[PDB]
Amino acid sequence: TKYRFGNKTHATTLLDEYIKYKGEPPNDEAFDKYLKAIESPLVMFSRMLFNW
Amino acid sequence: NFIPQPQGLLRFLNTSFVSKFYTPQLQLSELAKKVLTNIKTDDIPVLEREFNDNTIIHKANDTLLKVQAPRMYMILQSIVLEAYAIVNCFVENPSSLKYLTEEDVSITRENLNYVADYLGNYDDYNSVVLDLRDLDLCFSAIELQLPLIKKEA
Amino acid sequence: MKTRKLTNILSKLIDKTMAGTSKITDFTPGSASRSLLEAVSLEIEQFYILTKENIDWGIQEGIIEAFDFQKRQSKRAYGDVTIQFYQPLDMRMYIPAGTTFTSTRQEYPQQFETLVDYYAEPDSTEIVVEVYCKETGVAGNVPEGTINTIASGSSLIRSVNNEYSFNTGTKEESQEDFKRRFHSFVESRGRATNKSVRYGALQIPDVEGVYVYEETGHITVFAHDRNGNLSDTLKEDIIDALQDYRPSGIMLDVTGVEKEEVNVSATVTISNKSRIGDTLQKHIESVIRSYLNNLKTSDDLIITDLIQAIMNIDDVLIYDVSFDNLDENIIVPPQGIIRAGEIKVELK
């Protein structure tokens, strides 16, 4: 709500990784991972019938 | 009851060296004069698409004859108006064909030869001359056939 | 060879006939001989012109056949279509796949069709679904309020309308763009240089408008797609492609590009008072927004190109354009791209 970009599932994935790694993941990509993620049968019968 | 015209043709139509064989006279036909006034005053319908990439589309405007030889450019406009005028009546509203006469087309062909010969000097812009030569023989057929059409009709 | 006009050929024929032991003959207008000579000269001029055109076409065809460099095909037009219902849906509804969207105006009879399934959830008075133009051409760049028909539509639908014009469909690849890309390829034959890395980055169809900023023992490439994003798979593909073209023994890196937003607040003067309307304002806004997009990286916000582009729609109808705050060109950094921006039209 307080920022331009918002999402539930994408943010939840970051939280799950953040929780599992106890807030100290091996790489800083996890913090920026959320930011980069967010910015016929009827036809066939009719067609073949026309062809014949 | 008029077909809408292209935007490019509408824009085009609404406004020393000398050849020894044929020369111009800058004379306008009576029929051509009437069509010019109608387009100038009445807001004729126009098209929005420009799919047809022929005639003046990227050939009459792309060439530098507009800025280099404006007097020659005036001749091309006169031929287009005369060419458009004769095509207008036969396709629709043939009542305006009465004003046309033999001398109207005779002067037009002489103008076409003069501008055509001048364009022959330029090697890059022979594409315009390609259509003019084909159009040149079209007017001659009308010149040798127009008197019979009016009497027949 | 050298182009020969009708008059020179006719003069040469007349000179040859006079010098060919023939004094009785005359070349006055209206004579059969003069007409035949003129026809022959016109035939020869036609042959020369067609020969020159065939030479140009053969040069183009030989350049195409030479090497493995060829132009890419056109892109199908696509956009967003808005649906308005009489009342919010009480229950979930399923749109059958392949639903056809068309219009009724004679100028734009082109059809559209959906590629993926969509569902209309209940308590939703509107739904937006992407569409694609079946015909490959610029005809899909319809103006605002053109697509107003839907096939296999239920009675719940009240209206069909597209909020913005597509302005995405394109014809075949332009000659100038193909020539420029070929120049990039020819300049990129010598590997281990800026141009080689440039061509290696630009050869992928998806990426567009990359920039290279060489540094001391460090190479940075700010690659982005037409949408300004950089997915991981496309980034890895670009890195793998550049690996062959990458100079040996030096670091390479890529970190996408950062977007910037500026509000132009343009104002335009229109000669025709009657033609002024909301539709023209929306068209101008869409044109300016599209011009903001599809812009490469590391180029200043030039205003001259903007005014010449917007004025290209109609030289006579559009009189003049002026701006309030962005008169001076805005210098963009290597990692900055001018894509976003809110446009407000203030007609005088």
Residues of chain B contacting residue C6, judged by C-beta atoms under 8 Å apart: 116-117, 120
Numbers of helices and strands, H then E, in chain C = 7, 15
C182: CB partners within 8 A, 6+ apart: C63, C69
Q: Report DSSP letters for chain A, one per residue.
A: --SS---SHHHHHHHHHHHHTTT--SSTHHHHHHHHH---HHHHHHHHHHH-
Q: How far apart are CA A34 and CA A13, in angstroms?
A: 8
Q: Which chains touch A (3 or more CB pairs under 8 A)?
A: C
Question: Helix B126-143 and helix B102-121: axis angle, to 10°?
Answer: 160
C271 and chain B: CB distance < 8 Å anywhere?
no
Q: Is C225 in a helix, a strand, or coil? A: coil
**CB nearest to C229's CB, from A39, A40, A43:** A39
Q: State both tokens at B86.
A: 């004769």
Contacts of C107 in chain B (CB under 8 A): 47-49
Q: What is the resolution of this structure in A?
A: 4.4
Task: Kindly tell me whether chain C and chain A come into contact, counting contact as 3+ Cβ pairs under 8 Å.
Answer: yes
Closest CA to C270 of C311, C327, C215: C311
Task: Give counts: helices (H), strands (E), chain B.
Answer: 7, 0
The answer to whether C102 touches C151, Cβ cutoff 8 Å, is: yes
Minimal C-alpha gap between B123 and chain C (Å) = 6
Instruction: Output the six-digit token pair for C124.
Output: 């939703």
| Contact call for B133 and C3, based on CB within 8 A | no
How was this model experimentally determined? cryo-EM
Report residue C208: phi and psi, to 5°. Answer: -150, 135
Best of B21, B58, B109, B137 to disrupt the C interface (most C CBs within 10 Å) is B21
Rg, chain C, Cα only: 29
For C327, what's the count of Cα atoms within 13 Å in the CB-facing half-sphere?
A: 5
Residues of C in contact with B126 (CB under 8 A): 3, 49, 52
- Lookup: tokens for C131: 């569409």
Amino acid residing at C127: I
CB atoms within 10 A of CB B126: 19
Pairing type for strands C212-215 and C218-221 reads: antiparallel
Query: Can you read off the two tokens belonging to residue A13?
Result: 């994935």
Q: How open is the CA angle C241-C249-C296, to the nearest 5 degrees?
A: 45
The shortest C-alpha distance from C180 to chain B (Å) reads 21
User: Which of A36, A39, A43 lies closest to C98 in CB terms?
Assistant: A43
C-beta atoms of B121 and C5 within 8 A = yes
What are the distances in angstroms from CA C214 to CA A3, B34, C217, C241, C296? 35, 67, 8, 18, 18
